[PDB]
Amino acid sequence: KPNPLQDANLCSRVFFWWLNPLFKIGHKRRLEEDDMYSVLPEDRSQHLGEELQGFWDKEVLRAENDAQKPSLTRAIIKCYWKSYLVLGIFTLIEESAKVIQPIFLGKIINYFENYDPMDSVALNTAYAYATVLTFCTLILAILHHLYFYHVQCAGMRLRVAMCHMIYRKALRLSNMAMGKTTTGQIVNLLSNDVNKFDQVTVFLHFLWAGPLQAIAVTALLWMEIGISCLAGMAVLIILLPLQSCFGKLFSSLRSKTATFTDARIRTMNEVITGIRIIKMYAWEKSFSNLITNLRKKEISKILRSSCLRGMNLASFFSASKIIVFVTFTTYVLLGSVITASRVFVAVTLYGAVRLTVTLFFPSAIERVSEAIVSIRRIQTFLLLDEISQRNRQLPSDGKKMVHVQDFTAFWDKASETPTLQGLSFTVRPGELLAVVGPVGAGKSSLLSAVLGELAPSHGLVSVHGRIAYVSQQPWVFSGTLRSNILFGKKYEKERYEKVIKACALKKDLQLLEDGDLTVIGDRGTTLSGGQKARVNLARAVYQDADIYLLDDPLSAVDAEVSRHLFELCICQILHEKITILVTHQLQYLKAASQILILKDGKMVQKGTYTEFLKSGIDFGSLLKKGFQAYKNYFRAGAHWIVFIFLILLNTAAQVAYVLQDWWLSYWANKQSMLNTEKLDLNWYLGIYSGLTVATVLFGIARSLLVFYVLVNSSQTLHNKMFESILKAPVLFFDRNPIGRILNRFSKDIGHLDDLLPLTFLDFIQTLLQVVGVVSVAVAVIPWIAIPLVPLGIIFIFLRRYFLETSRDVKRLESTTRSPVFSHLSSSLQGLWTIRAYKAEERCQELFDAHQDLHSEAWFLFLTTSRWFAVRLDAICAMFVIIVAFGSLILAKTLDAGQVGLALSYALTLMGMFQWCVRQSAEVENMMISVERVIEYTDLEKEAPWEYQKRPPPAWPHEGVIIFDNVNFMYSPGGPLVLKHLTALIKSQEKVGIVGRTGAGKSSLISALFRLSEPEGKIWIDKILTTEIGLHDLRKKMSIIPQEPVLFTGTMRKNLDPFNEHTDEELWNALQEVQLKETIEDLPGKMDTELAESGSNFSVGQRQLVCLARAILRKNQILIIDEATANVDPRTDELIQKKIREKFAHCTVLTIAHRLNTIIDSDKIMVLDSGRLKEYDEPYVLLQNKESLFYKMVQQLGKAEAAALTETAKQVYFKRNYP
């Protein structure tokens, strides 16, 4: 994929002309990883990594020679100064130009100040000065981009080399260091601490071109306006600390919101997760109250932080006005006079040095501090203790064989008992050694010592040959199954087909789409544990070393395939292979040609299976121990009157900005047309200060008002969205996962709260400044309106042409970045397997090929943005040229003030135009947040919580519940679930439910609570359920859910969230489940704050809590579901006895998976695949041998069925015959 950057000229590499073809393709179709362009040979990850590693090794070597700490920063500087001195040369040129061009502005204006139409010599000199002005702006606009590319390229190169050394080191970490670190800490300095290098370079050069320029400019100012410059200059310096006390006060209001944003997001997580429980309990007004309180207390801090941000941005807007105003007030007051050449040079000098001092120099300071911190982190990571490379082997005679003598080892230099105690045994070719021992013996550590991963303390280990190893936990990397097996070995058809058949892989391959070519990412997302183990075994077989180690291979797989693998591969294929096995299944020990027993780190006995049969020790004995979106985003914030006032306030701010400099222009003109006489100073300074103050106040007012309106729009959108997600029917929560729903509450509203109202105000600010500049140049030279239409059409078409590719290549440098982190993860988790094979260097090449695929989209993201900015500055330079020259070919009409104003504003168009366009892109990029928030504010809604027909207070009087032809569906057009459900429930009876899993057992609760408005009728005490609103239907029915949940809060809440009960009642209820005592030993009485789902509580305890809830509600209906799944039998019978003897006079339906739970129930639904068929007393249904109840009783067993039938008969005979 050749790179046209390689075959291009200089006249082609300045205008990035090599990149037009890609853009053309980008205009037709979408871009893929083929359309991309490969990288230069001077940028492949391997080359940079090798070079920087060379310098880093030299530097640490000299550190050892000198006994002082090695510094990575010195290595980076030593490898990169020779190539970062060139870019310094050019930024020196660029700063000199930004300082020179005001002086030629001065000379042009000075020609206008002494206009004489006949002195054509002066006209020719002024034309020369304008030509020099356009040369300066054309080296500031066209040759500043073949520079910025390389300044970002030095940062790219540094970062890619750093990533390569980081992976290289993390591939050879000693286990002692490996354990003390993590694998989240070795991806956090490759995803977030090696990105700083992509940015520090961009600004590094301003640590010396920042101050130097701020002196050069000062000197120039001194030559023109004299001492007064200091006055103005003083103010500029004050913007350095004031900018860093809007930062150590905004960072105290921005990390005092996380303690509220995260509370709200966590409460979201609980509300969205357990929404079926909240709806069934009819609680969501409580969570609505909680979330309203949290959201209001984060809007307080969002509103303070945004008011402060707006004040900062208005200071940035009006700083230039205040500098110029104080400069020229001091300039005039010391007794000098205003002429139009010094005024509009000094303005431009202040423009340049303000853009450097207040914006670029502090940014470079921040970014160099961040890159130094990151270099320190990678510095520490590169000094972790390594692994002894496999050293000079003892001279052998070609006998591949394993022998260990008197081996003792520790995993810690502080452990008392050694991991191994003097182990001395061996294995030869063809001898399938095996290890037998319960968990805690050290067999895993035994194989680890075999691999050398455990440092020998005494004895000796002699392993001579290629080693194939299998970890206890199978490990799969990002790649296809054939590539998974090959692990770098070239494919061989027969040697792979025998692998396929001996591993019994055919079933799994026929399951998946690509046969054996299905791509398997990290953690085996496309595989199962048995598949992982089998593919790991296949890798071990195909790598085909001498000595093989197999640790617990067959435990997690089926018996037959495990037998096949052990017999026709381990017993058969490996009978000619050195092998060590750690096992847990006894049947295979007969096939072990040797047996090793390990215990307490000490050898117990070695021998064949026969000698341990004769030993008298059975193994088991040992083994046991669009535009509409903008309109909706703006309508929410305020009514349109405030919006029209907002527009007038923007316009007043901009117009007063422009009119201040216009006032200097008019002042200068009124000084020229003079004469001693003087000029009335009080009037002029009065209006000058009036215009400056109007600029400042209108800037502050515009910024605060825009922030307030957009923050208020965020608040209104969130309140609407949330109060419309609490009312969405559970069907919606089923369609959308928990991840996406709670993503538009944390990330999206996360934008809408603090990044639209800042990007959308910055965009408005600089857009109105661009319009200010263009309208000044059109009010002076009206003819400019003609060429400036072919700089509107060209601009719009340019931006369309460019955003159709900068949106196809700013997703390629994102969807090819993750594979780097994924490969790093998959290689650290499989680390022992990798380092067991001598092929760790091949994983280095895989990392590079995953890093020459992100440094291949960073290349395009760095040069397509430049192909855009070169052209934008061609447009801005055409404008500056037209203003500079067209101000002369019409010299007869203009004057010094008009020309100064028009020209210096055109000079500031540079850069301001580009920031305006960049924010336009970013705002159109973050209105997707608003589009999603507004997509949720328009969801479905279940029936309203209240109806006109409120129920009688005593209702339900008894508990009569009648199902009349209830036909219920989960979703429209789906399978009919309950079909003609016609049943009667007379007061207080206990009705079990029987059926198949999902055959309608758990749908009766779904329809009875109207979780999906059912078809049919349900009468609760002769009242239709559909005819009453929900919270007058769910408040009057209790339920015991499958998995109880406790909602984060005081235990006073998880029982009485509405504060409708009193401490005596709560204590009594908790007593009825006998857990009252179990609570009154916690820090608080009830008010112990809890973790998720009451993690300090047990499942049985949670069930007790919900049973207490049911007791507290004391309504005369009740529904139980999945009483005890795996709860301990004591708590089982506990809950059972409270279930009967607590709720005798409260109608009970029970939906249980077992029979003893429901054997004694008064009646039983029988649900036949979504159909009620049998419903009567259990004894009657057992009388008929053909009843499904009889059949499913008989399916348990003989003694079980006899006991159950006896119990049902006992109930019948005690009940119906007194």
Ligand X SMILES: OCCN(CCO)c1nc(N2CCCCC2)c2nc(N(CCO)CCO)nc(N3CCCCC3)c2n1
Nearer to ligand X by Cβ, of 283 and 913: the residue is: 913
766: tokens are 């600089």
- The closest alpha carbon to 420, from 386, 390, 460, belongs to 460
CA distances from residue 372 to 200, 280, 361, 844, 852 in whole angstroms, order as listed:
9, 55, 16, 26, 26
Interaction of residue 363 with ligand X, rule CB under 6 A? yes
Q: What whole-number distance in Å separates Cα of residue 978 and Cα of residue 465?
A: 68
Tell me: is residue 886 an annotated ligand-binding position. no
Could you please report the per-residue DSSP string of 1128-1156? -HHHHHHHHHHHHHHSTTSEEEEE-SSST
Residue 316 Cβ vs ligand X, minimum distance, rounded to whole Å: 5
The neighbouring-strand residues paired with 402 are 427, 463
Least distance between ligand X and beta carbon 827 (Å): 34
Smallest separation (angstroms) from ligand X to the CB of 295: 28
Minimal distance, residue 275 CB to ligand X, in Å = 41
Cβ contact 1169:1011 at 8 Å? no
Cis peptide before 956 (omega within 30 of 0): yes
CA 352 → CA 163, 216, 331, 877, distances in Å?
37, 11, 20, 17
Using the minimum distance from each CB to ligand X, give the nearer residue, 688 or 868.
868
CB closer to ligand X, 175 vs 363: 363
Residue 918 as a binder of ligand X (CB under 6 A): the answer is yes
Q: Which helix (H) or strand (E) holds 404?
A: strand 402-409
Q: Is 861 in the site for ligand X (CB under 6 A)?
A: no
Interface residue with ligand X, options 322, 345, 355, 450 (CB under 6 A): 355
Count of residues that bind ligand X according to CB under 6 A:
11
User: By CB under 6 A, which span of 255-263, 567-575, 914-922, 1174-1182 interacts with ligand X?
Assistant: 914-922
71 lies in the binding site for ligand X (CB under 6 A): no
Distance CA 1204, CA 1155 (A): 8
Coil, strand or helix at 548: strand
CA distance 630 to 787: 32
Least separation in angstroms between residue 90's CB and ligand X is 14
CB proximity list for 407: less than 8 A, separation 6 or greater: 420, 422, 423, 424, 449, 456, 458, 459, 460, 461
Instruction: Classify each residue of 60-72 as buried b or exposed e, where b means 16 or more C-beta atoms within 10 Å of its C-beta.
Output: beeeeeeeeebbb
Of the pair 355, 1069, the CB lying nearest ligand X is at 355
Q: Which residue is nearest to ligand X (CB)?
A: 915
Q: How far is the CB of 253 from ligand X (least distance, A)?
A: 17
- Of 370 and 852, nearer to ligand X (C-beta) is 370
Nearer of residues 766 and 1147 to ligand X, judged by Cβ: 766
CA distances from 353 to 165, 398, 697, 911 (A): 40, 76, 24, 14
Compute the least distance from the CB of residue 143 to ligand X, in Å: 14
221 vs 355 by CB, closer to ligand X:
355
Helix, strand, coil shares, percent, the chain, to 5: 60, 10, 35
Contact letters (x/-) for ligand X, 265-304, by CB under 6 A?
A: ----------------------------------------
CB of 649 to ligand X, least distance (A): 18
Residue 150 in the binding site for ligand X (CB under 6 A): no
**What SS3 state is found at 1116?**
coil
Is residue 1000 a known part of a binding site? yes
CB of 362 to ligand X, least distance (A): 9
Q: Provide the angle, in degrees to the nearest 10, between the axes of the packed helices 681-723 and 640-672.
A: 160
55, 60, 78 from 74: Cα distances, Å: 9, 10, 6
With CB under 6 A as the contact rule, which of the stretches 631-639, 913-921, 999-1007, 1179-1187 interacts with ligand X?
913-921
286 carries a ligand binding annotation: no
Name the 3-class secondary structure at 160. helix
Of the listed pieces 810-818, 819-827, 907-915, 1006-1014, which binds ligand X according to CB under 6 A? 907-915
| 1197 labeled binding residue | no
Establish whether 276 is an annotated binding residue: no
If phi over 0 gives left and psi between -120 and 50 gives alpha, with beta otherwise, what is residue 980? Answer: left
Q: φ, ψ for residue 1198 (rounded to 5)?
A: -95, -60
Please identify which residue in 246, 643, 915, 1212 interacts with ligand X, judged by CB under 6 A: 915
Nearest-approach distance from CB 312 to ligand X, in angstroms = 9
Was 132 annotated as part of a binding site? no
CB atoms near residue 526 (< 10 Å): 15
CA 42 to chain centre: 32
Q: Is 1064 exposed, middle or buried (0-12, 13-18, 19+ CB in 10 A)?
A: exposed
H or E stretch at 1017: strand 1015-1020
461 CB-near residues (< 8 Å, 6+ apart): 403, 404, 407, 449, 450, 452
Nearer to ligand X, 96 or 1183 (CB): 96
Specify the stretch interacting with ligand X by CB under 6 A; choose among 86-94, 251-259, 908-916, 1116-1124: 908-916
Query: Which of 914, 925, 1098, 1183 is the binder for ligand X (CB under 6 A)?
Result: 914
Q: Output the smallest distance, CB 766 to ligand X, in A.
A: 5
Pairing between β-strand 1015-1020 and β-strand 602-607 as defined by DSSP bridges: unpaired
Distance CA 923, CA 757 (A): 10
Nearer to ligand X, 514 or 924 (CB): 924
Task: Tell me: is residue 713 an annotated ligand-binding position.
Answer: no
- Window of 30-38, 63-71, 233-241, 911-919 that interacts with ligand X by CB under 6 A: 911-919
Q: Which two tokens stand for residue 92?
A: 């020196």
Closer residue to ligand X in complex, CB, 369/585: 369
> Binding residue for ligand X (CB under 6 A) from 122, 911, 955, 1176?
911
> Restricting to residues 755-774, which ones interact with ligand X according to CB under 6 A?
762, 766
Nearer to ligand X, 359 or 788 (CB): 359
Q: Is 201 helix (H, G, I), strand (E, B) or coil?
A: helix
**At its nearest, how many Å lie between ligand X and the CB of residue 803?**
15
Binder of ligand X out of 14, 307, 326, 359 (CB under 6 A): 359
CA–CA distance, 985 with 1020 (Å, rounded to integer): 10
Select the residue interacting with ligand X from 912, 933, 1046, 1118 (CB under 6 A): 912
Q: Least distance from C-beta 148 to ligand X, angstroms? A: 7
**Least CB distance to ligand X at residue 845 (A):** 36
Give yes or no for residue 358 binding ligand X (CB under 6 A): no
Q: Which of 612-620, 912-920, 1129-1137, 1203-1211 is the region at the interface with ligand X (rule: CB under 6 A)?
A: 912-920
Residue 303 or 359 having the CB closest to ligand X: 359
998 is in an annotated binding site: yes
264 annotated binding-site participant: no
Q: Give the SS3 label for residue 1119.
A: strand
- Report the residue number, 411 or 915, with the smaller CB distance to ligand X: 915
Q: d(Cα 99, Cα 1049) in Å, to the nearest integer?
A: 63
Alpha carbons 598 and 446: distance in angstroms, whole number: 9
Binding flags for ligand X, 863-902, as an x/- string (CB under 6 A): ----------------------------------------
The answer to whether 443 is annotated as binding is yes
Q: Is 309 annotated as a binding residue?
A: no
| Residue 999 assigned to a binding site | yes
Taking residues 299 to 318 in sequence order and writing x for each that binds ligand X by CB under 6 A, - otherwise, the string is -----------------x--
Per the CB < 8 A criterion, the answer to whether 480 and 521 are in contact is no
Cβ 858 to ligand X, closest distance in Å?
Answer: 18
Feature table: binding site for ATP: 437-444, 995-1002
Give residues in contact with ligand X (CB under 6 A).
Answer: 316, 355, 359, 363, 762, 766, 911-912, 914-915, 918
